[PDB]
Write a protein that binds this ligand. Structure first.
Ligand SMILES: Cc1ncc(COP(=O)(O)O)c(CN)c1O
Ligand SMILES: Cc1ncc(COP(=O)(O)O)c(CN)c1O
Lengths: 388, 388
C-alpha cells in the first residue's frame, strides 16, 4: 500500500505519541485509511487535464468547477438551494477561522462558544486577541435562553460580540448532533441581536448510520442570512491537503473574495483544489466516503461495544451518530486527573475534557478514527482495567 | 506537452486579458514555461516516499526536510548563517503578508513603504485596516533620511508604525536592486527606531546574469534582528502551488508557529510542500531555475533591445538585473493616460505606474515573463509605433 508509515515521524507529521502508547487522543485518520493512492492519481489527472492552468494563479474565490460541485453538494445535503457564488475555497478551516477572526472581528471583540467546544479553535480566537465567553449547553448543544442572556449581558457591559461559534453536527468533543428545532431557536436568538454565527462543519460528511444524514445546516436554515459555514477536506481526504471551503450569502462571499489576500494570491490552494476537483467529478470522492464511513462505523462500534460491556456504572456514554469522537461523562466524585492517571497506567492516550471547557463532573474524549477495531478494543480493555 | 493552455480560462485561472490583447501587464509566468511535468513527477514521488505522512497533518512550522534545505539555501545566498529553526512554511507570500499585517500589526497602525511598491501588497495592508505612508526613494530604493523623518514624524503624532515593507531585490515595479551600502543604512535607521522590517523577496532567485547573485538580504545583514523575510515559490515554480516560506530570528519564528493557526491546522501547505521538497532534494529545482533564468534573460533582452527606438526618444529605462519587469520613465510632458491610450491602440496591455504609487513623471511597468521573445518584440514595435 502507498499508505505506509515509514515517514510518520516527528518533524514530518504534526505530532506522534510516545512509543508504546495506544493513541486515542487526536482526531487523526488512521494512516492506513488515508487515501494516498487516490490522491496520487488525482494530482496526475489534474495536472494533465488542467495543464499550465494548474500552476498559474487560480481564480480568486477558487476554481469554478470545484465551486459548482461544492454548491450542488451543499444543496443536496440541506435540501435547500446553494449557488456557486456563495462558495469560497480556503486552505483549511484553521486558515478560514483565522481569516474570520481578523476580518469579521477586531481585537477585543468577544466570541461566544458552547461550554465545551473545539480547543484549538478557541486558541485561534484567543491568539487573534478575541475574548471568549462560554454559553450553557445540554445534550443538543448551546441553550437558546443562555445565548439570549449572554448577548443581552454582553451588550449592557459594552462587550462587542463578533460572532457565535458553533459546531452543530458531530460536535467536538461530545459527538452530539444539534436537532432541527434547536437550530431554529438559536437562529431566532441570533437574528434578534443581529449577531453573526460561524458554523464549523468539519464532520458534516461523516454520518455513520447509512441512509441517515444530519439536519440542514444553520446557514441553509437561515437562508444564509448572518451565517458563515466552514467545511474542510481534512476529515474526509487528508488534513495535510490544506483545503476547505466557506459558504455565505453571495454578498459576504463576494466581499471576502475581493480582499487583497485573494487579489494578490488568487485561490488559496489552487493546485491541490484541482486534484480534489477531479475526485468529486468522477464519483471517486463519494466512493471513498462510503468506504471510509464504513471503516469509521466499525471502529466506533468496536470502541463503544467494548467500553459499554466493560465500563463502570457511573460513566455515561452516548453513541455519536458520526464524526471521530466518543465522549465519556464520569461526573459524580470521579476525578479527571485520576482517570488520566488510569489511562497512563493502561498505556493509552486520551483527551482531557477540561481542554474543551467546563464539564459537569469529569469528561474524557476518545477518538476512534486513528486505530483499527482490534487496537481500539484492546485500549478499552486496558482503560477499563486501570479504572476499576 | 503538459504545459498546455486548454484550461487557461476565466473561472480557472485568476485573470485572462481580453481577446486580441498582447499581455505585458501581469507578472505571470508564460504558460509554456510553467513546469507542469516536473511537478507531476514531484507529487508522484512525494506521495510514494512520504506515504500516509503526506496526507496527515504536517509538522506545524513545516516539514523539517524542506525547512533544513531552505535554511541552507538562504545561508548559501547570503554567505551568512541561517538555522532551520528560523524557517516557517507559508501558503504563499500573500497569505504571509496577511498573517503579519494582522498578527504583528493592529488596525490603524502605519506601514511605511517606498513611493513605488507592490500594488496588491498595499491592498492587503489597507484591507487589514493599516494606514500606508510612502517614503521617498531613488534608484537604490528607500532613502534613509526620508525613512528617519517618516518614523520621527509618526512618533511625534503617536501614529504607531507596524513595520516598514521593502522589496530590495528586483523591485516591483522598477526592477532595481538595493545595494549593500543602502541596505545597511536603512537597517541602521530602523534599528534606532526599533521598527520591524518586512522584507518581501519574491524575485530573489531570479538574477538573470548567470554569475551574479544579489546582495545579502536585509534579514541576514541584521542578524535577523527585527526583520522578517518572505520568500515564495510563485515566481520560480508556479503561483498556483500556494507555497512559500518566512525567515526570522528563532524567537519570532517560534512565536509565530505556536499561534493557534498552526497548532490547529499544522503546516500551512503540507502535501504540496513535500512535492516541492523532493525537487530541492534532487537538484531538480536548481536545474529548473537555471533553465528558467535563461528563458527570462532571453525575454528581457528581446524586449529591452526592441525598445531601443523609444529610449533614444527620451524614454528612460534602467535594465533590471533580474525578476520579471521593465520600468519605463517617460519624463515631463508625457502623460500616463496618453501613453496608456497608445498601448490600447497598439493592442498591448501594460501596467500603469500610478498603480504602484507616486512617479516622477509618467512611469509604466512592462513584464517580460509571460510571452516568448518574438511576441515581446512585436509588442514593443506596436507600442513604439503608437507612441511615436
Ligand atoms: C471542530 C473542528 N474544526 C476544525 C478542525 C481542523 O480544521 P482544518 O483541518 O480544516 O484546518 C478540527 C479538527 N481538530 C475540528 O475538530
Ligand atoms: C513583491 C511581490 N510580492 C508577492 C507577490 C505575490 O506573492 P505570492 O504569489 O507568493 O502570494 C508578488 C506578485 N505580484 C510580488 O510582486
Amino acid at each position: 500500500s502507498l499508505s505506509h508509515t515509514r515517514q510518520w515521524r516527528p518533524g514530518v507529521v504534526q505530532e506522534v505519541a510516545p512509543a508504546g502508547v495506544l493513541d486515542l487522543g487526536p482526531g487523526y485518520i488512521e494512516p492506513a485509511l488515508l487515501p494516498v493512492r487516490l490522491l496520487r492519481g488525482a494530482y496526475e489527472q489534474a495536472l494533465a487535464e488542467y495543464g499550465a492552468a494548474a500552476l498559474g494563479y487560480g481564480h480568486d474565490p477558487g476554481a469554478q468547477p470545484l465551486r459548482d460541485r461544492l454548491a450542488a453538494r451543499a444543496a443536496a445535503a440541506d435540501g435547500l438551494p446553494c449557488d456557486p457564488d456563495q462558495v469560497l475555497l480556503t486552505s483549511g478551516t484553521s486558515q478560514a477561522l483565522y481569516l474570520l477572526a481578523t476580518s469579521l472581528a477586531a481585537p477585543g471583540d468577544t466570541v461566544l462558544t458552547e461550554e465545551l467546544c473545539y480547543d484549538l479553535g478557541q486558541r485561534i480566537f484567543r491568539d487573534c486577541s478575541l475574548r471568549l465567553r462560554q454559553v450553557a449547553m445540554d445534550g443538543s448543544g448551546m441553550l437558546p435562553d443562555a445565548l439570549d442572556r449572554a448577548l443581552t449581558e454582553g451588550a449592557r457591559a459594552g462587550a462587542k460580540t463578533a460572532f457565535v461559534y458553533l459546531t452543530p453536527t458531530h460536535h467536538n468533543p461530545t459527538g452530539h448532533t444539534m436537532p432541527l428545532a434547536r437550530r431554529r431557536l438559536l437562529l431566532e436568538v441570533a437574528a434578534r441581536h443581529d449577531v453573526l454565527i460561524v458554523e464549523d462543519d468539519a464532520y458534516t460528511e461523516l454520518s455513520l448510520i447509512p441512509d441517515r444524514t444530519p439536519p440542514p445546516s444553520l446557514a441553509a436554515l437561515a437562508g444564509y442570512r448572518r451565517v458563515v459555514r466552514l467545511c474542510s477536506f481534512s476529515k474526509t481526504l487528508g488534513p495535510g491537503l490544506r483545503l476547505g471551503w466557506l459558504l455565505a450569502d453571495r454578498e459576504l462571499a463576494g466581499r471576502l473574495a475581493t480582499h487583497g489576500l485573494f487579489v494578490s494570491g488568487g485561490s488559496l490552494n489552487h493546485t491541490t483544489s484541482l486534484a480534489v476537483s477531479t475526485l468529486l467529478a468522477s464519483g471517486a470522492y463519494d466512493r471513498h466516503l462510503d468506504a471510509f464511513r464504513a471503516q469509521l462505523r466499525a471502529r466506533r462500534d468496536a470502541l463503544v461495544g467494548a467500553l459499554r460491556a466493560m465500563l463502570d456504572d457511573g460513566v455515561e456514554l452516548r453513541t455519536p451518530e458520526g464524526g471521530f469522537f466518543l465522549w465519556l461523562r464520569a461526573g459524580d466524585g470521579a476525578d479527571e486527573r485520576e482517570l488520566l492517571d488510569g489511562a497512563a497506567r493502561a498505556g493509552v492516550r486520551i483527551a482531557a475534557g477540561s481542554r474543551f471547557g467546563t464539564t459537569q463532573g469529569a469528561g474524557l474524549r476518545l477518538a476512534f478514527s486513528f486505530n483499527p477495531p482490534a487496537l481500539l478494543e484492546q485500549a478499552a480493555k486496558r482503560l477499563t482495567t486501570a479504572w476499576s
